[PDB]
Amino acid sequence: MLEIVLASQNSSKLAEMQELLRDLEIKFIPQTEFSVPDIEETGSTFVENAIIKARHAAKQTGLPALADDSGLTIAALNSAPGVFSSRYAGKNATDAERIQKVLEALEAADDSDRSASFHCVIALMENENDPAPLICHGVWEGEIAREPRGKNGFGYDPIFYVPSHQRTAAELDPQEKNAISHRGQALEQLSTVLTEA
Amino acid sequence: MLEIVLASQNSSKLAEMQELLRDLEIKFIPQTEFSVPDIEETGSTFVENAIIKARHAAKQTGLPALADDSGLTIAALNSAPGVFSSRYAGKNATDAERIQKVLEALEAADDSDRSASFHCVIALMENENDPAPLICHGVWEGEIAREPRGKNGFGYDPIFYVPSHQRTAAELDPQEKNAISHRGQALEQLSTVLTEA
Numbered sequence: 331m332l333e334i335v336l337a338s339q340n341s342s343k344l345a346e347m348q349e350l351l352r353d354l355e356i357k358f359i360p361q362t363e364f365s366v367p368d369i370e371e372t373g374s375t376f377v378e379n380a381i382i383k384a385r386h387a388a389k390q391t392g393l394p395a396l397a398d399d400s401g402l403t404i405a406a407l408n409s410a411p412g413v414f415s416s417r418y419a420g421k422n423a424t425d426a427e428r429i430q431k432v433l434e435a436l437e438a439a440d441d442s443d444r445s446a447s448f449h450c451v452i453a454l455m456e457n458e459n460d461p462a463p464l465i466c467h468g469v470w471e472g473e474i475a476r477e478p479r480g481k482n483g484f485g486y487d488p489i490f491y492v493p494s495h496q497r498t499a500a501e502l503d504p505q506e507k508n509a510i511s512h513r514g515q516a517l518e519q520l521s522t523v524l525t526e527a
Numbered sequence: 528m529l530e531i532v533l534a535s536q537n538s539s540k541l542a543e544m545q546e547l548l549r550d551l552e553i554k555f556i557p558q559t560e561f562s563v564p565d566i567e568e569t570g571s572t573f574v575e576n577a578i579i580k581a582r583h584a585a586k587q588t589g590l591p592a593l594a595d596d597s598g599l600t601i602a603a604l605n606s607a608p609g610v611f612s613s614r615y616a617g618k619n620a621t622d623a624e625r626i627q628k629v630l631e632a633l634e635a636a637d638d639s640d641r642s643a644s645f646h647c648v649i650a651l652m653e654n655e656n657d658p659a660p661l662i663c664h665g666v667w668e669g670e671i672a673r674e675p676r677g678k679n680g681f682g683y684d685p686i687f688y689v690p691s692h693q694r695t696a697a698e699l700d701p702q703e704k705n706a707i708s709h710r711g712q713a714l715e716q717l718s719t720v721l722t723e724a
């Protein structure tokens with residue numbers, strides 16, 4: 331049984347992964363099971379943070395490690411909030427607060443372009459010295475709505491309008507969102523590689 | 528016309544690029560046309576270094592920038608020389624010196640497994656603050672020979688045995704190498720993306 335450490339403490343991320351690779355002989359183990367502490371994300375790109383976290387987990391555990399970083403990028407805001415997606419409305423802020431700051435920022439930029447994208451970058455390291463980690467990059471293109479809509483999901487989901495569905499991410503059923511999202515796409519890229527291996 | 532800064536002083540890499548995207552309305556400008564000072568690669572992965580270089584070029588020039596990092600990974604040496612491929616026997620060591628160093632490292636490891644692979648990671652940054660650069664990753668699988676052979680190529684080519692061709696990279700005609708190498712693959716990925724864009 332191939333053992334891979336998951337850097338994330340996020341339970342939904344682990345569950346999504348187990349579901350994804352259910353037919354493969356691979357076992358994901360949260361880094362917390364090795365008492366690995368979180369490491370600070372200091373990169374300016376998702377890929378840099380994904381690597382930082384995977385390399386850390388691999389270093390401490392001695393096993394292969396997989397990490398991801400994700401965020402919302404808005405064209406009119408020069409790709410902000412980007413890697414500051416979680417920090418966009420200050421520390422200790424809520425999802426609702428962050429949504430409002432994004433809406434205000436666009437309002438202030440008064441730029442007709444509401445284009446935006448969700449990104450998920452997964453990095454898989456064989457060990458901490460791996461110079462060529464597997465990189466999977468999922469991209470989900472949409473638009474920022476004028477006001478929050480939808481009961482599902484989390485974070486910026488309520489203002490992420492999905493043109494193909496004429497609904498926001500928060501309006502989609504969970505399964506449908508997870509099938510077409512930036513995470514879904516990254517995960518399918520990962521599965522293709524792992525399955526082939 | 529779209530202008531992209533190439534963060535490389537290598538004339539062959541520029542020529543290969545122009546040749547590759549000859550049908551596209553893109554002009555590649557070497558960073559030397561902007562007097563960009565070279566920056567130090569501090570990453571432990573090719574992708575990290577490509578991003579460093581691309582980010583630097585974009586910041587200094589104000590234009591989108593493309594960069595690459597490349598190396599040889601040898602399984603018996605835990606993926607070494609890896610990101611130190613261009614530093615393996617000293618910053619000023621000749622290609623011949625590095626080859627000998629690799630051969631010596633291998634015979635010291637006493638591992639019947641001579642599996643190795645060339646890597647080329649390309650990163651394209653819209654600007655210095657781009658959190659989601661395009662990453663193209665070309666991989667070329669082969670093995671390390673026991674002695675150098677072949678009149679073509681450069682660097683580690685004389686000891687990169689290519690099972691599919693029963694020759695080293697240096698023995699291949701230049702056009703054949705370029706069609707199958709880690710760089711050729713990375714460039715084809717870039718071209719697909721840029722063309723469809």
Ligand SMILES: [Ca+2]
Nearest residue numbers: 371379399400
């Ligand atoms: Ca993050």
Ligand SMILES: [Ca+2]
Nearest residue numbers: 568596597613
């Ligand atoms: Ca280099």
